[PDB]
Ligand binder design. Structure first.
Ligand SMILES: CCCCCCCCCCCCCCCCCC(=O)OC[C@H](CO)OC(=O)CCCCCCCCCCCCCCCCC
Ligand SMILES: CCCCCCCCCO
Ligand SMILES: [K+]
Ligand SMILES: [K+]
Ligand SMILES: [K+]
Ligand SMILES: [K+]
Ligand SMILES: [K+]
Ligand SMILES: [K+]
Lengths: 96, 219, 212
């Protein structure tokens, strides 16, 4: 069951593509703060984990479409990663 | 290595257009943005616009009149800015700069001096400046060269092709009858000249001319 | 759009002193401010990034501080090579914006100009014109006045002057005075004289040459 590793790879891809496309969509909109790659990657993590502090968010339509993709693919893949971790921890419970 | 190479000058007629270029070297990444900055003489820096070469999208300063169009070519690693329908207000130095997508301009080009004028390009005349026969010699001797009647700006004066960096003044050009004139001065130990050669190098990129002139005592 | 205010616009300092440049943003921008230096005729050069982070190759005496709206760039012990214009720039919100810039001036010890007069060259004479060039170099303070004399009588027509900004090598100033006339008018006179009147001396420093 190493497809948890496959889920982790998809999540990292979603995070990286989200960071690249968010900066691409948000630059050109006056007032936008999601405009440099390092903090855009931090924003992708915030969204994939659904934490959503609100220190960063998109204000353009395409940035918000990029966010929707990061929500759908990122929350799903992140859900597969934590599910795997939870099942593994339940396995150690059995060892007692 | 110089990471961003720009032409030195462009002369544009009023109403005409020009395409400036910026050739990049060194590390290139997909996160690279190329910026363009305009500086009118005696003024500050004014952001024109940006382009991401890896994708081709450009954004422009919305506070000023849209006069530029940005393109890029990944093959030659060259970014272009099309300045169209130029007037006297567009005469300035135009820098390009590279930003690694992290907000600051790590590397700047040398800038392209754009002059919008109907006058004609004229190469400069270079004349040596040696002391007169009666000038008393101190422990240092001051030589120079006279760069007269050129258009447009700028010219670049070096002394012994850069090896004589210390003790050099290049005075700002003065404009007269649509032709600029300036002078450059160099000071060396008086025991050194003329036993060691002292030569000025004047470049005029708008005319693609480069001239050397040796400063000999007398004629 | 973030407005960056750099006030004061000019900063006058004695050598070795500590100097501080102020940059204030129209709203809070965290630490997303960057500092650049531009010497006379040079390209901007990055000094500090993200308000306080140093850049490889920049002297240790450059540092920066601040967050929110108030930022300052500091030079520990200013030196002649620091004479330049200094710009701040923000990357917190689109679009990136620049401050208006602050000029650094150094108050140095007074210095009298080195005056040198040059007769026209052979090459220039064989083309119809003649220019007598006078160099007034490495003086301080900036205020200076040149007077041209031909055969003892002062001359005003045909004189073009140029002044350098403060020299980034020794904090002095320099000036060129070029008197341009026709060849026949040059050969119709004898003594040529430029006279430098500067704060450093009551009597004018003058240099002359006879064509004969
Ligand atoms: C599915 C999720 C898509 C994200 C919504 C983006 C709209 C915000 C926006 O656009 O903000 C960007 C921009 C504002 O800067 O909006 C604009 O100019 C462009 C607005 C275009 C409108 C497209 C969607 C509007 C549909 C509303 C239907 C509600 C039922 C009636
Ligand atoms: C959902 C994918 C959107 C990709 C961003 C396109 C950038 C638009 C620039 O106007
Ligand atoms: K939440
Ligand atoms: K939340
Ligand atoms: K929140
Ligand atoms: K909040
Ligand atoms: K809030
Ligand atoms: K949940």
């Amino acid at each position: 069951w190493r497809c948890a590793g496959a889920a982790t790879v998809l999540l990292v891809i979603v995070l990286l593509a989200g960071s690249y496309l968010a900066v691409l969509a948000e630059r050109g909109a006056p007032g936008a703060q999601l405009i440099t790659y390092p903090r855009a990657l931090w924003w992708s993590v915030e969204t994939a984990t659904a934490v959503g502090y609100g220190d960063l968010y998109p204000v353009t339509l395409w940035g918000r479409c990029v966010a929707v993709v990061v929500m759908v693919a990122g929350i799903t893949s992140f859900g597969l990663v934590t599910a795997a971790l939870a099942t593994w921890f339940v396995g150690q419970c059995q060892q007692q | 290595q110089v990471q961003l190479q720009q032409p030195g000058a462009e002369l544009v007629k009023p109403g005409a257009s020009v395409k400036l270029s910026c050739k990049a070297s060194g590390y290139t990444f997909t996160s690279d943005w190329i910026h363009w900055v305009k500086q009118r003489p005696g003024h500050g820096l004014e952001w024109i616009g940006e382009i991401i070469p890896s994708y081709g999208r450009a954004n422009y300063n919305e506070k000023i009149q849209k006069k530029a169009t940005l393109t890029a070519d990944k093959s030659s690693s060259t970014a272009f800015m099309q300045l169209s329908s130029l007037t006297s207000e567009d005469s300035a130095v135009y820098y390009c700069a590279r930003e690694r997508g992290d907000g600051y301009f790590a590397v700047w080009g040398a800038g392209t001096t754009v002059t919008v004028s109907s006058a004609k390009t004229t190469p400069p005349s270079v004349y040596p400046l040696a002391p007169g026969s009666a000038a008393q010699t101190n422990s240092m001797v001051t030589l120079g060269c006279l760069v007269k009647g050129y258009f447009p700006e700028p010219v670049t004066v070096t002394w012994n092709s850069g090896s004589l960096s210390s003790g050099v003044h290049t005075f700002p050009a003065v404009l007269q009858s649509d032709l600029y004139t300036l002078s450059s001065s160099v000071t060396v130990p008086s025991s050194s000249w003329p036993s060691e050669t002292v030569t000025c190098n004047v470049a005029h990129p708008a005319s693609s001319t480069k001239v050397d002139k040796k400063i000999v005592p007398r004629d | 759009d973030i407005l960056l205010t750099q006030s004061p616009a000019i900063l006058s300092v004695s050598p070795g002193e500590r100097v501080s440049f102020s940059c204030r943003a129209s709203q809070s921008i965290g630490t997303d401010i960057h500092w650049y230096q531009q010497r006379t005729n040079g390209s901007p050069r990055l000094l500090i990034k993200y308000a306080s982070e140093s850049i490889s190759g920049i002297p240790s005496r450059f540092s920066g501080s601040g967050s929110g709206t108030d930022f300052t760039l500091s030079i520990n012990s200013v030196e002649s090579e620091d004479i330049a214009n200094y710009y701040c720039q923000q990357s917190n919100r689109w679009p990136f914006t620049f401050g208006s810039g602050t000029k650094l001036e150094i108050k140095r010890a007074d210095a009298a100009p080195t005056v040198s007069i040059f007769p026209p060259s052979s090459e220039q004479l064989t083309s119809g014109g003649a220019s007598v060039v006078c160099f007034l170099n490495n003086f301080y303070p900036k205020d200076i006045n040149v007077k041209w004399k031909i055969d003892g009588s002062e001359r005003q027509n045909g004189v073009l002057n140029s002044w350098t900004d403060q020299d980034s090598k020794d904090s002095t100033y320099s000036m060129s005075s070029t008197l341009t006339l026709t060849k026949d008018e040059y050969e119709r006179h004898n003594s040529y004289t430029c006279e430098a009147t500067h704060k450093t001396s009551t009597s004018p420093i003058v240099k002359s040459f006879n064509r004969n």
